[PDB]
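Translate sequence into structure tokens.
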Amino acid sequence: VNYTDEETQKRKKEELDKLMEPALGYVTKIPVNIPSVRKTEISEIDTVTDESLSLVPNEDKLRTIANENAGSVVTKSGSNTMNFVRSGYTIDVVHYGLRDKGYVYYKGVHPSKELPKGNIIVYQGEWDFTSNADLDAKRPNYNPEFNGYGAGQRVGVTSADAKERTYISKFNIDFSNKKLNGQLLTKTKENQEKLRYTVEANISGNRFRGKATATDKTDPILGKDSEHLEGGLYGPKSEELAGKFVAHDKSLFAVFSGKRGNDVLETVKIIDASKIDLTTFESSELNNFGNANVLIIDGQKIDLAGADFKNRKTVDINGKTMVAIACCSNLEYMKFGQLWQKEGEQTKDNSLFLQGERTATDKIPVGGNYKYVGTWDALVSKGTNWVAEADNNRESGYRSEFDVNFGDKKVSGKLFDKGGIVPVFMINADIKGNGFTGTANTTDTGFALDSQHGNAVFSDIKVNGGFYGPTAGELGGQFHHKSDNGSVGAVFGAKRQIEK
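Result follows.
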């Protein structure tokens, strides 16, 4: 007797909803009936957290199985066409019995921090799928589209199993309106195309969420709708996309890719996500999907919101235990703070991070003078270590204060040590697009490293920043420098003010 959990229709939708969380990629195993059951749904759907397009999800696992019984594992990734995404399958084509048949997946790299400015941009690619296994789903003993006897009856049938058919995808992305619509088609030997699915999605950050609608509801395999399509834009300037959808009855799992042509487009920043290493004082990029309140370390997510003003988060990621201090509760569209791996009382790879969701360029104020107030985080190293740790005290704390002139397109900034009545860093920058670039300086003679102890001096250090939120009511930025006469790494964020 086969017993399984009674899943309510509530939980079904909830576990489907869970599949909509953004990730570098997704992979599912092709369902295979155990002898006593008649039907096996798609259910083993896992996120992909590794970041190399060369690695095929769970391929190795399948390969270790393959050789033993028969051997023939085929892999399709679209590596000959795509540069930032991989989609397809890795399967045992000589599969029989109850062992694994393989996996369908998509994955991507460098989630886009820059999108095209506007207009409708075309992306072409491929798609693949696996079905569930169902003896009772009107699937014919002979299939005019799929190789073999009773394809999809005892074992999920895939795009790999099709008779001389290519599975083409086309997408139209309206970057002006952040809408996406597309087609999943099948092309036969005689170049006749058949629309299998239309897709529609809304873009948010570098991700889209939407639905896939089945062209032919009488199709025994590709005939069910999905209200759960999710994917992302990949590559620094949105060169490519990839994604998936799950049929509402878990009877199908599809993956797709897309790549736009060589037309050079104007782009805009939508996301800031970088970290400064506090020993090299170099800046590296972080993966981000357009939610600044979530930190992606090793393809795994860390939530940064909390009840306090700034919040300490401890999260275990691949045996690497990570700790982040994220500020601030009054910042809705950006986060910054410290990040490190913990080793008992030892701490490795200390770094500062900054994340923000850029304001739309056309939503940056064209004129007006506003004050921004926040705090900051920094490390300075000239012999000893001076440090700034974000706080809540507007009066004598680690203050950051900014005068922004949207008319004259300028940012003037002050960064204070605690107690200090005078600033220790003076930021001057010009507003360009939805960001700003400029310089950070100390006074001629600098500031004491606390408290014959050293003085720290920094001249014309490059400052990079952005305006965040719907109408740029938040701003943040960073600067870093390394030399033997001193080194610094700093992140800051500030909220727009109103006279009270």
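Note: The first strand starts at residue 25 and ends at 29.
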